[PDB]
Design an enzyme around this catalytic site. Structure first.
Site, mmCIF file in Angstrom:
data_model
loop_
_atom_site.group_PDB
_atom_site.id
_atom_site.type_symbol
_atom_site.label_atom_id
_atom_site.label_comp_id
_atom_site.label_asym_id
_atom_site.label_seq_id
_atom_site.Cartn_x
_atom_site.Cartn_y
_atom_site.Cartn_z
ATOM 1 N N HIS A 102 0.809 -1.223 0.000
ATOM 2 C CA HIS A 102 0.000 0.000 0.000
ATOM 3 C C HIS A 102 0.842 1.274 0.000
ATOM 4 O O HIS A 102 0.316 2.361 -0.275
ATOM 5 C CB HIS A 102 -0.932 -0.050 1.206
ATOM 6 N N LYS A 104 3.092 4.392 -0.943
ATOM 7 C CA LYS A 104 3.122 5.287 -2.104
ATOM 8 C C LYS A 104 4.381 6.123 -1.984
ATOM 9 O O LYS A 104 4.475 7.009 -1.117
ATOM 10 C CB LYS A 104 1.897 6.205 -2.183
ATOM 11 N N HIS A 327 -8.291 11.183 0.174
ATOM 12 C CA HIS A 327 -7.564 9.934 0.090
ATOM 13 C C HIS A 327 -6.252 10.039 0.842
ATOM 14 O O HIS A 327 -5.600 9.012 1.096
ATOM 15 C CB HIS A 327 -7.358 9.595 -1.410
ATOM 16 N N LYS A 329 -4.183 10.271 4.306
ATOM 17 C CA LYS A 329 -4.387 9.791 5.668
ATOM 18 C C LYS A 329 -3.450 10.567 6.564
ATOM 19 O O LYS A 329 -2.267 10.754 6.229
ATOM 20 C CB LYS A 329 -4.107 8.286 5.839
#
Ligand SMILES: O=P(O)(O)Cc1ccc(Nc2c(-c3ccccc3)nc3cc(-c4ccccc4)ccn23)cc1
Length: 438
Positions: A102, A104, A327, A329
């Site tokens: 996950h 990025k 999107h 966090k």
């Protein structure tokens, strides 16, 4: 600003709310450096779209895609990349069930040095179009001259910690990037790395990853203040995992306990969770399709209705982004009047045990299912006791931290519900005139 924390550009806000935002085309521009090669760590990829975001003159430079896809999904990604002989792939091992890759991150090697970008967006058009996303841009790191022996290490240990994160993949393409990082000077870095990697960590490794990594950094590099129990915790995310039958199972036992740590000496602390309501999504720039990037399922939600009494609406007037669904966090520790923060984290990690870790074996082992990555802003790393909160995200008195959404968070109303993506909404249409019928 010393923080180098950015939002992505949003199509459909006034220019003043994109002044100092970044699109992916800006990040990859020749103005940021003369690209030699790059690594794109992510979850989802649209390869045709991705290559077009690079400057034409750089589109044939080597690109490594670091992903977690298996079986037919892996085949589809390989098929996407096969037309581009400059594209290589690294399948991150996911040996615990239900984990994802996950993280990025971009590693950008230049003629002039190296840059690291840790951010929150998938590499697809929609994630950079009308969403609220976060980016941390590293400094341009210069090369250490050959024959010079120096660490290139920062006071936050970022260089070693990034190499440690990459070493966990056990991947030959990433050892090449580790060797690139060894050759550069990362000593100007003022953020702490917080990663998750899959595994079962005990003893000397339990503090390396996930929420125990956060806890360790807060114990070692933050101090407690009087009335600390009055300083809330805020968590802000775009997906929700199965957290258990009540708040004592994980959220308010081990997760909150890590998040409320300050300093080295041994709860009524308010916990705010920010997650879009159905009305947030309906009235958003994207409309109901925004909810395709908010994958909270009804099967999960109906097992933990206790959780929704913690939920607060998305609101971001400070950055003109109340209608740009999040999107990004983020996690942070504001003062009781929300005028200061003790720390701020931007990360890929949503509110789930897979991302943050869950204790096992009588509290001696932390089990993590996924790869995640974020950066932690601590006042001590800037010579400060706390950060002031910036009143207007894009305004201008700059040891002030740019929190991208409004404080205090606003509790759901009695008619609000959390966005749940796999049930229909047919009572009122969205900004494009449509209903939502999964
Ligand atoms: O901020 P104030 O004091 O209210 C003054 C004020 C008043 C109206 C606008 N309308 C507006 C919007 C806009 C409006 C409302 C929602 C979303 C976007 N987007 C633009 C873009 C340009 C543009 C022109 C050429 C090159 C690049 C950009 C011009 C105007 N645009 C902007 C500013």
């Amino acid at each position: 600003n010393p923080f180098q924390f950015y939002l992505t550009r949003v199509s459909g806000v006034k220019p003043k709310y994109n002044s100092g935002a970044l699109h992916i085309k800006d990040i990859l521009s020749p103005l940021f450096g003369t690209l030699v090669s790059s690594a794109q760590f992510n979850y989802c990829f649209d390869v045709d779209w991705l290559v077009k975001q690079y400057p034409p003159e750089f589109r044939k430079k080597p690109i490594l895609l670091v992903h977690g896809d298996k079986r037919e999904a892996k085949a589809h990604l390989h098929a996407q990349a096969k037309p581009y002989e400059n594209i290589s792939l690294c399948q991150a091992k996911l040996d615990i069930a239900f984990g994802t890759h996950h993280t990025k991150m971009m590693l950008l090697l230049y003629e002039e040095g190296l840059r690291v970008v840790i951010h929150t967006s998938n590499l697809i058009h929609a994630d950079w179009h009308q969403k609220t996303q976060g980016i941390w841009l590293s400094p341009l790191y210069p090369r250490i001259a050959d024959g010079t022996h120096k660490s290139g290490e920062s006071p936050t240990h970022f260089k070693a910690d990034l190499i440690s994160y990459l070493m966990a993949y056990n991947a030959p393409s990433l050892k090449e990037w580790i060797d690139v990082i060894h050759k550069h000077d990362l000593s100007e870095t003022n953020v702490y790395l917080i990663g998750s990697t899959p595994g079962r960590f005990q003893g000397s490794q339990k503090d390396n990853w996930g929420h125990f990594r956060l806890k360790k950094l807060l114990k070692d590099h933050a101090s407690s203040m009087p009335n600390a129990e009055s300083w809330p915790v805020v968590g802000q995310f775009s997906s929700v995992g199965s957290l258990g039958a009540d708040e004592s199972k994980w959220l308010c036992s081990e997760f909150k306990e890590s998040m409320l740590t300050l300093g080295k000496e041994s709860s009524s602390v308010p916990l705010y969770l920010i997650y879009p309501s159905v009305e947030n999504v309906r009235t958003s720039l994207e409309g109901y399709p925004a909810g395709g990037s908010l994958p909270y399922s009804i099967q999960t939600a109906e097992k933990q209705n206790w959780l929704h009494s913690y939920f607060h609406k998305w609101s971001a007037e400070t950055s003109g982004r109340s209608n740009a669904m999040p999107h990004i966090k983020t996690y942070m520790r504001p003062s009781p009047d929300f005028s200061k923060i003790a720390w701020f984290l931007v990360t890929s990690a949503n509110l789930s045990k897979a991302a943050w870790g869950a204790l096992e074996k009588n509290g001696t082992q932390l089990m993590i299912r996924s790869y995640e990555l974020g950066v932690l802003f601590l006042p001590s790393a800037f010579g400060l006791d706390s950060f002031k909160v910036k009143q207007k995200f894009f305004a201008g008195p700059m040891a002030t931290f740019p929190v991208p959404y409004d404080l205090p968070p606003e509790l759901y109303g009695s008619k609000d519900r959390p966005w749940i993506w796999n049930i229909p909404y047919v009572k009122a249409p969205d900004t494009h005139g449509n209903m939502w019928v999964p």
